[PDB]
Amino acid sequence: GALSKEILEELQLNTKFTEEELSSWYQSFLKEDPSGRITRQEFQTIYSKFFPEADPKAYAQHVFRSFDANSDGTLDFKEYVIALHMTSAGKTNQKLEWAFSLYDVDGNGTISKNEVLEIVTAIFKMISPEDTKHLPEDENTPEKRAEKIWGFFGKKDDDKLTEKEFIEGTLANKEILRLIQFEPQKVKEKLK
Ligand SMILES: [Ca+2]
């Protein structure tokens, strides 16, 4: 029941659901997954089903990991609902702390150049083959996009990017926001 309250607590104005609606979704969730827990592979299946034009396995794995920096174990209903909101609802700039957790692949508290490339590659694979030709030349491969992000942050190859700086840059430089953007529809849309 009151798992819905803590979901609302953590999404706040990001929510697309009332407490009653979340409880309804939860009861349906329990019919299909009675433990109230979903594994990474079950989570990946949701994205595979709903992004048929793409190759969403890596993306879904990184989103799952954003909760804990762990590929093992499960998400509960709260984390599952929050995950779907992060990928698919609301405004990117209301998600910046979560975005830091997405990009900090190993969970060590800072983002490295390789981590940016890993996440940018996973997001890139969410784009349909048809759409990637609308990409600007200097943003049309994962390497180009990740290096542009790293350059906008003023970083050398072995530098570390902190949460403070990530939040600042993603707020202030709209090119950084556009390039780190992780919601597939928003990448698609801005492209078009
Ligand atoms: Ca890291």
Residue 32's Cα: distance from chain center in Å?
24
Cα separation, 161 vs 97, in Å, equals: 13
C-alpha of residue 21 to centroid of ligand 1, in Å: 36
Does 68 show up as a binding residue in the annotation?
yes
What is the dihedral angle through the alpha carbons of 15, 18, 24, 25, rounded to the nearest 10 degrees?
-10
C-alpha of residue 14 to centroid of ligand 1, in Å: 26
Neighbours of 67 (CB within 10 A): 19
Cα separation, 44 vs 157, in Å, equals: 31
The residue type at 181: Q
List the resolution, Å: 1.5
Contact between 13 and 94 (Cβ < 8 Å): yes
Residue ranges of the chain assigned to CATH 1.10.238.10:
6-91, 96-183
CATH for 6-91, among 3.40.50.1370, 3.40.50.620, 1.10.238.10, 1.10.10.10?
1.10.238.10
